Design a protein around this ligand. Structure first.
Ligand SMILES: CN(C)[C@@H]1C(O)=C(C(N)=O)C(=O)[C@@]2(O)C(O)=C3C(=O)c4c(O)cccc4[C@@](C)(O)[C@H]3C[C@@H]12
Ligand SMILES: CN(C)[C@@H]1C(O)=C(C(N)=O)C(=O)[C@@]2(O)C(O)=C3C(=O)c4c(O)cccc4[C@@](C)(O)[C@H]3C[C@@H]12
Ligand SMILES: [Cl-]
Ligand SMILES: [Cl-]
Ligand SMILES: [Cl-]
Ligand SMILES: [Cl-]
Ligand SMILES: [Cl-]
Ligand SMILES: [Cl-]
Ligand SMILES: [Cl-]
Ligand SMILES: [Cl-]
Ligand SMILES: [Cl-]
Ligand SMILES: [Cl-]
Ligand SMILES: [Cl-]
Ligand SMILES: [Cl-]
Ligand SMILES: [Mg+2]
Ligand SMILES: [Mg+2]
Lengths: 198, 198
């Protein structure tokens, strides 16, 4: 079938949904594409290359809140951004595993530079803004991975029994959203402290 | 060589360090143990079973701050606990990947019940205590995975160039510790608010 970049990526994401990340292979992608392996190789050199591009394309396609709205507070941007990042990661099977270990791609440079600049224009040092952004990313990544990998892997004392009912009660959104608010407020307390002991 | 549980686990962890998690296999474990595969099978049924037990044993062996000290504040316990969890996850290659998707084991029940009880004795509802504990776990998991998987996978606008120097500057401990403080303070602001609008 068609082997332009967009079509290869479409097929790969469809396969990711079928197999998950551990089970995704270039051999299986070739089969899905109706092509022989040396044909695939011309287009896609190895699994790493493919995973690198899926991480980028999952966000380009589905991570819609990458930029602050005009006038938006930094707290609100981080909140919407995290929510959007989470949704994009959850969209495909093992999506968070796909993102892990990537670094920003050149096609994301201007976006991510805008995010870092925006934090600094709101009073953060570059370093502190980066810490806040990285904490949001790590927290969101952790939460999504816990959920998705929990699913992959698939006598109690009373408080643990209950905690597990609680967790078995929703998809992880409630705990994520509550933690996110805590994270943001801690950042704010830090920012507003300046050089005061806090 | 010896195939009691402790010896199998020792050998598996040594192998994990050599191969990482994706490359860890029961065939390679058998080779390391000097035994044939059907011999290994008697002891270890599959990879999942082995990963499940490594997650438990990495914490039993190296996660030393699982319990509050007498008199310790909840904020301090979460801090020490997170630090200890991080260190244990970083101890083996792909350690955080090994933990992901596990649930508490019966051998951890009494420990984890004590943690949940401790949060409730400090004013948290079970639900809110669990959210705090899960946020710490997810944040710490995210941070460790970002680091370890970054390593596995191994023109810039100026703020991104600098951010990447910053990140290339330490192992991830500084950003983790700073984020952790933010997370804890947000939890505290929440706890102390009671029913006030905050
Ligand atoms: C916080 N939010 C989830 C950010 C985001 O929305 C992104 C986006 N493309 O819109 C990311 O790329 C974003 O999700 C993301 O992945 C980011 C990163 O990986 C990094 C890394 O690894 C190193 C330095 C800088 C960044 C970063 C500033 O680009 C990160 C921004 C992340
Ligand atoms: C926060 N800190 C890192 C905790 C910890 O120190 C643990 C330990 N064994 O000492 C965990 O098991 C701990 O790390 C950990 O893994 C915990 C969990 O996985 C869960 C899950 O998945 C579901 C319900 C309850 C828990 C939990 C209360 O046992 C978690 C406690 C985690
Ligand atoms: Cl076609
Ligand atoms: Cl073509
Ligand atoms: Cl194209
Ligand atoms: Cl492959
Ligand atoms: Cl295959
Ligand atoms: Cl990452
Ligand atoms: Cl022996
Ligand atoms: Cl034996
Ligand atoms: Cl033993
Ligand atoms: Cl295997
Ligand atoms: Cl093998
Ligand atoms: Cl997990
Ligand atoms: Mg990233
Ligand atoms: Mg766990």
């Amino acid at each position: 079938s068609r082997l332009n970049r967009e079509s290869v990526i479409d097929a790969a994401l469809e396969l990711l949904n079928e197999t998950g990340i551990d089970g995704l292979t270039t051999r299986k992608l070739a089969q899905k594409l109706g092509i022989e392996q040396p044909t695939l190789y011309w287009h896609v050199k190895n699994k790493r290359a493919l995973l690198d591009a899926l991480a980028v394309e999952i966000l380009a396609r589905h991570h819609d809140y990458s930029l602050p709205a005009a006038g938006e507070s930094w707290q609100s941007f981080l909140r919407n951004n995290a929510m959007s990042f989470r949704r994009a990661l959850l969209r495909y099977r093992d999506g968070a595993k796909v993102h892990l270990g990537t670094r920003p791609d050149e096609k994301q440079y201007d976006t991510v530079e805008t995010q870092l600049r925006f934090m600094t224009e709101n009073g953060f040092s570059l370093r502190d803004g980066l810490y806040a952004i990285s904490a949001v990313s790590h927290f969101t990544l952790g939460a999504v991975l816990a959920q998705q990998e929990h699913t992959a892997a698939l006598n109690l004392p009373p408080l643990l029994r209950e905690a597990l009912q609680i967790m078995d009660s929703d998809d992880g959104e409630q705990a994520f959203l509550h933690g996110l608010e805590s994270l943001i407020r801690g950042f704010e307390v830090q920012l507003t402290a300046l050089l005061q002991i806090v």
